[PDB]
A paper describes a structure:
Clostridium thermocellum has extensive potential in lignocellulose biorefineries as an environmentally prominent, thermophilic, cellulolytic bacterium. Previously, five putative sugar transporters, denoted A to D and L and belonging to the ABC transport systems group, were identified in the genome of C. thermocellum, and the solute-binding lipoproteins (SBP) of these ABC transporters were shown to bind different dextrins by isothermal titration calorimetry (ITC) assays. To gain insight into the structural mechanism of the transporter specificities, 11 crystal structures, both alone and in complex with appropriate saccharides, were solved for all 5 putative sugar-binding proteins, thus providing detailed specific interactions between the proteins and the corresponding saccharides. Combined genetic, biophysical, and structural studies have provided solid evidence that transporter A and transporter B are the major glucose and cellodextrin transporters, respectively, among the five potential sugar transporters in C. thermocellum.
The unliganded CbpC and CbpD structures were determined to 2.00 and 1.50 Å resolution, respectively. A Dali search using the CbpC structure revealed similarities with several sugar- and other solute-binding proteins of ABC transporters. However, the expected substrate-binding pocket between domain I and domain II in CbpC was blocked by an additional loop that was absent in the other proteins, suggesting that CbpC might not be a functional sugar-binding protein. For CbpC and CbpD, no interaction was detected for all of the tested carbohydrate substrates in both ITC and NMR experiments, suggesting that transporters C and D are not responsible for glucose or cellodextrin transport. However, regardless of the exact specificity of CbpC and CbpD, the knockout mutants of these associated transporters clearly indicate that they do not play a significant role in the utilization of cellulose by C. thermocellum.
Residue numbers in the entry: 33 to 299, 301 to 386, 394 to 460
Write the structure that this text describes.
Amino acid sequence: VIGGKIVMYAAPGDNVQSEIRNIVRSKYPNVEFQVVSFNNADEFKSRLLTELMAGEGPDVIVLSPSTKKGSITIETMRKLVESGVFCDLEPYISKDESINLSEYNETVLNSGVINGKRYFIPIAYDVPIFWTANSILEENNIKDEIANWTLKDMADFAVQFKEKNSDNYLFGYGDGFIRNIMYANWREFVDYENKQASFDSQEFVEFLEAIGAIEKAGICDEKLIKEYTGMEFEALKHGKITLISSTEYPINPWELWYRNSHINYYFPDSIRLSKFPTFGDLGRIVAHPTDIVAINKNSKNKATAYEVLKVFLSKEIQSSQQFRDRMGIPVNDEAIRELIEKYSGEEGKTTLPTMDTVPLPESVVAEYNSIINGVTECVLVDEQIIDFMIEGFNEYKNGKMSAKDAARMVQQKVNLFLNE
């Protein structure tokens, strides 16, 4: 029997849950939604997390725990999941004929499988990438080399760039750029299964030295990009930045068409994208979820809560306008398939505030597909681990410690974080 009360909380900027309720109420008209809306971000995070760890809270939990634009960043989301505040979703997925995991990005969905239990469903994710205009790549003679760049190839371009351009930044923008380097390379130094890290290693020292040369070429602040009327595209046109990597906007099909159209406005040009230059001998391309849904372990109306949870995965929700504005890259494969088709055809030839847009070029779609289809794993990482890596890099960058002392400090804090 699908019905009864379902309690769920709404974060300040939430516009998707109202969609879910109408669809959920279209079927099962007996579901009684009790919505608690929040206007303060700190009151939402404080009340939700404290209630879950005290055995209370809403029946269905919608969270944005990473660092994208409208997120409520949670420091130890993975440890919170490991404490068991959410129930295992496998008994519901197994019993349900109507759901089939082949329709979704299974590599991303596996981020919700921790310690052998499907604790949550990631409805959207992000892949750290850097992008720019193609004509800017040809002006720097790296049009055909950034796709095969290593992190040391990028640092060596940054030193050569810093010696060439001494009044412009090489990268933008904000703190999201350096976090993107950590998002792409933390797996190289952290073994969650065995609860140990290898930050006190020659690889991480060279990793810090590589980031140090990259940052010396300049990363403009987020407060310098908002000053431009054309945002990062205008600053790219004026030469203030050359390569862009940011955490604010995951590259959903709309963002790709939006960036390509804006770049074509300032330059006949197209967007060029690439996965982040990574370290190591292995071929890891690591994504992380930005939006998750789960059921409270102490909910007395499960199965009804599971029915509400599934609507977040539907092609209709995942391809909606509200989902595009507030969530990351959708995990429903048909939604991505439908969205790319829309911006690759006549609907991609419209107007954007005003400028004339162009449909996505075949070249851009193939480069986009090579990245999302190239994701090798998707892991929910504790944001605190990423913060430890950054505060270790800042000690070396700010001349407070040597590279080997900063690698040893990160190894300490992370190893004792993994072991409680």
